[PDB]
Design a binder for this molecule. Structure first.
Ligand SMILES: Nc1ncnc2c1ncn2[C@@H]1O[C@H](COP(=O)(O)OP(=O)(O)OP(=O)(O)O)[C@@H](O)[C@H]1O
Ligand SMILES: C/C1=C/C(=O)O[C@@H]2C[C@@H](CC[C@H](C)/C=C/C=C/CC1)O[C@@](O)([C@@H]1CSC(=O)N1)C2
Ligand SMILES: [Ca+2]
Lengths: 360, 411
């Protein structure tokens, strides 16, 4: 009688029970590359080698089905301690997830895990839905991918979805590079975890990048310090905002795509002119990588600069932003008018993997 | 009473037939088109420059460019009249246009030396140069008292069904075409007119499908020709291409770019490259086709950070030209390309556009026939392809000078 919601991210699995406010488990979306045989999730925070760290979802898309099964297995049995047979299951997908892909998911959910029912929602639509909305444009930025997703009346407009393979994982690698440039050495995969933490702990987005560079050069006000596990404490200076500045200038990292303000604009512009006002007023941020202090204000400034000067521009950055995909799923899976939406074992047995396209 | 295919030097019969044709064709222009033409005569240089360069921007920038309405309407005017048999036309080029980046003779000399002639032949003779945009041409070889702005005269055979608008500009008869093809120069002879030497180049049209910004028309063609391609693979080939497509490209291409196959052989990868390659021969490119690849600096031995990469400075274009024009770049990796010419978020900042002419029957596929693929209207070409860089052009995208590389696939 109680639905599971499981949000499958490039780097983190967010899992739990519909009707709850937060997921119950969140854990790493990793398994194992062997020489008992393989440890899954937060348990592979152990033998990460020579039984090594593998990522079954990359850039939002499932590509290693075998390790995906194991992630799901772990979710149900090791993490949520429930029986998949006993619970309708809402799963999330990336924007522009291929049909083929959505069907493999369904088939496996029904045949391997024997769920009574299931549904797949677009991750961005649920974020929008978490903040009471059905029209809006979502910046979803996680670990492996970032999207701009315009949505009108609960529908994503697939032709206007922007995709950047630039996100939190690349931001940690880059913090590693620049901190190394300062005379530290952060290069190993273990060290990669400490810089993730430094990133989450001390980075921010300058309202004016060139100005922040000048402040940091001419005074000391912007330095913060950080204790490593071995008790060494390091200093961190302009790396603090240089790191997430990459989101606006992918060239910091050698990338030549547009930045997140530009893909936002592009996305809006590929939409038809009658809905644009609605989109500018309803820019929702979600995903761990939109967590930087300053980012909403910075986005506000950049979009103001590109948009017509008569435009009302609102950036919505909920404090729960990093679980808002999950939360939207909790809200949906409990919504009563949502109950006719589930796909039952029965309907799957009749119509096959293909029923998963209903029209929402 | 029938026009010949070539008025040669016969200026008087050229005008006479063309004035008649102008009065006939002019009757068939609609309002939009006559307006476009009246507009062209007042502004031909700006209007032509736009028609060279227009596809390279984002769709939304195309759709809302104030110059775009005039382009579409002038385009339509030209194609209202389509010649029932080939006609030869005559026009002067600057030699820059064919990557001869030096004078043939000065504007004052009357002879073109044995050396320059010969150098010119090596430069231009063996290539297909891309032509684009609105051009004024003439129907007769110029003689005494016609403008003769360069030492280089083009004598081009326009095939049957080429669109050609003859029109009266108050006193003269003029001839307007939209170049939408490539040129080969079969011969160059010297020739004399009013005491000075000129080069006359015999040129012929090689035709190529080029959808430019029309990604929809481009898609129709791709799916019409490639949606049964997936079913033509072996089990193994399907899986190895699905792997490339869904994310395997970075490891396969990285392995090729360091020439792993020889330097440090990886037999799983080798088999994967072998299958993809074999798969790329199941539906060879069924027609001559122009594709567009937006390139990173790394593709030309450069970095985002190299000062040689700032194309805002002529020196650097001039140096890129030296390094590449006339040269042939080999791609060790699989090269992914698009039939669209537009700018896209994923590569908004890239500054080098490799515009490639693919001969009919080359290996290649319209991967985008397979639903869900992240590449945009993508054609994939085989690893180890060579590209002849016939000509390097440049254009302004906002304040950023980017480069267009007229290239040809040579297998
Ligand atoms: N306070 C913070 N500041 C900056 N980054 C953060 C913060 N909290 C989490 N992150 C980053 O968020 C990323 C994970 O967020 P999220 O769970 O939204 O991504 P995901 O769903 O796993 O992956 P994706 O959406 O790319 O598929 C990690 O890179 C993490 O470092
Ligand atoms: C609370 C938490 C957050 C987190 O780490 O998110 C994810 C999880 C992680 C899995 C692999 C490593 C060993 C971590 C195991 C346990 C991690 C603690 C989990 O891969 C990331 O680290 C990547 C690499 S570094 C980065 O920026 N993205 C993001
Ligand atoms: Ca996510």
């Amino acid at each position: 009688t109680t639905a599971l919601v499981c949000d499958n991210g490039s780097g983190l699995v967010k899992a739990g029970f519909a009707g709850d406010d937060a997921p119950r488990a969140v854990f790493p979306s990793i398994v194992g590359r062997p020489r008992k045989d393989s440890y899954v999730g937060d348990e592979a925070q152990s033998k990460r080698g020579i039984l090594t760290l593998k990522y079954p979802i990359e850039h939002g898309i499932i590509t290693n089905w075998d390790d995906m099964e194991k992630i799901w297995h772990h979710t149900f049995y090791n993490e949520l301690r429930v029986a998949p047979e006993e619970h309708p299951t809402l799963l999330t997908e990336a924007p522009l997830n291929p049909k083929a892909n959505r069907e493999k998911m369904t088939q496996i959910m029904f045949e391997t895990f024997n769920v009574p029912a299931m549904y797949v929602a677009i991750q961005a639509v649920l974020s929008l839905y978490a903040s009471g909305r059905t029209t809006g444009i979502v910046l979803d930025s996680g670990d492996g991918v970032t999207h701009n997703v315009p949505i009108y009346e609960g529908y994503a407009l697939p032709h206007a979805i922007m995709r950047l393979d630039l996100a939190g994982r690349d931001l940690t690698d880059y913090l590693m590079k620049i901190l190394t440039e300062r005379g530290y050495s952060f290069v190993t995969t273990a060290e990669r975890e400490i810089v993730r933490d430094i990133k989450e702990k001390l980075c921010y987005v300058a309202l004016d990048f060139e100005n922040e560079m000048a402040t940091a050069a001419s005074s000391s006000s912007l330095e913060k310090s950080y204790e490593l596990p071995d008790g060494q404490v390091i200093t961190i200076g302009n790396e603090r905002f240089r790191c997430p500045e990459t989101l606006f200038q992918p060239s910091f990292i050698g990338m030549e795509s547009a930045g997140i303000h530009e893909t936002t604009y592009n996305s809006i512009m590929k939409c038809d002119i009658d809905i644009r006002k609605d989109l500018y007023a309803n820019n929702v941020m979600s995903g761990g990588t939109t967590m930087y202090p300053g980012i909403a204000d910075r986005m506000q400034k950049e979009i103001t600069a590109l948009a017509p000067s008569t435009m009302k521009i609102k950036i919505i950055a909920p404090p729960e932003r990093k679980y808002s995909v999950w939360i939207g799923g909790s809200i949906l899976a409990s919504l009563s008018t949502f109950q006719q939406m589930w796909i039952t074992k029965q309907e799957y047995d009749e119509a096959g993997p293909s029923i998963v396209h209903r029209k929402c | 009473i029938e026009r010949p295919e070539d008025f040669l030097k016969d200026k008087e019969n050229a005008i006479q037939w063309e004035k008649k044709e102008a009065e006939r064709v002019e009757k068939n222009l609609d309002t939009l088109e006559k307006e476009a033409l009246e507009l062209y005569k007042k502004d031909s240089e700006q209007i032509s420059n736009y028609s060279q360069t227009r596809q390279y921007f984002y769709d939304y920038q195309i759709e809302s460019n104030p110059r775009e309405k005039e382009y579409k309407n002038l385009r339509n005017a030209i194609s209202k009249n389509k010649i029932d048999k080939p006609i030869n036309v005559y026009y002067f080029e600057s030699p820059e246009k064919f990557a001869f980046n030096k004078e043939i003779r000065t504007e004052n000399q009357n002879e073109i030396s044995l050396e320059k002639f010969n150098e010119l032949k090596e430069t231009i003779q063996d290539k297909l140069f891309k032509q684009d945009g609105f051009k004024d041409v003439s129907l007769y070889e110029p003689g005494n008292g016609d403008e003769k702005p360069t030492p280089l005269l083009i004598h081009l055979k326009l095939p049957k069904n080429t669109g050609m608008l003859p029109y009266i500009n108050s006193n003269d008869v003029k001839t307007l075409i939209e170049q939408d093809y490539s040129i080969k120069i079969d011969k160059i002879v010297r020739i004399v007119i009013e005491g000075k030497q000129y080069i006359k180049a015999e040129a012929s049209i090689v035709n190529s499908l080029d959808f430019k910004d029309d990604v929809s028309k481009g898609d129709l063609w791709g799916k019409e020709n490639y949606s049964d391609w997936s079913n033509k693979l072996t089990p193994n080939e399907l899986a190895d291409v699905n792997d490339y497509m869904r994310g395997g490209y970075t490891a396969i291409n990285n392995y090729l770019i360091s020439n792993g196959p020889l330097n440090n052989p990886n037999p799983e990868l080798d088999s994967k490259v072998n299958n993809i390659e074999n798969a790329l021969k199941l539906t060879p490119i069924p027609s001559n086709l122009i594709v567009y690849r937006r390139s990173g600096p790394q593709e030309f031995g450069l970095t985002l950070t190299s000062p040689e990469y700032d194309f805002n400075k002529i020196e650097n274009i001039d140096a890129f030209k030296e390094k590449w024009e006339g040269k042939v770049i080999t791609y060790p990796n699989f090269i992914s390309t698009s039939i669209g010419s537009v700018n896209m978020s994923a590569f908004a900042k890239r500054k080098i556009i490799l515009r490639i002419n693919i001969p009919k029957d080359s290996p290649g596929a319209y991967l985008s026939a397979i639903p869900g693929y992240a590449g945009e209207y993508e054609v994939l070409l085989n690893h180890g392809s060579k590209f002849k860089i016939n000509k390097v052009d440049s254009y302004k995208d906002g304040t950023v000078t980017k480069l267009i590389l007229d290239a040809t696939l040579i297998n």
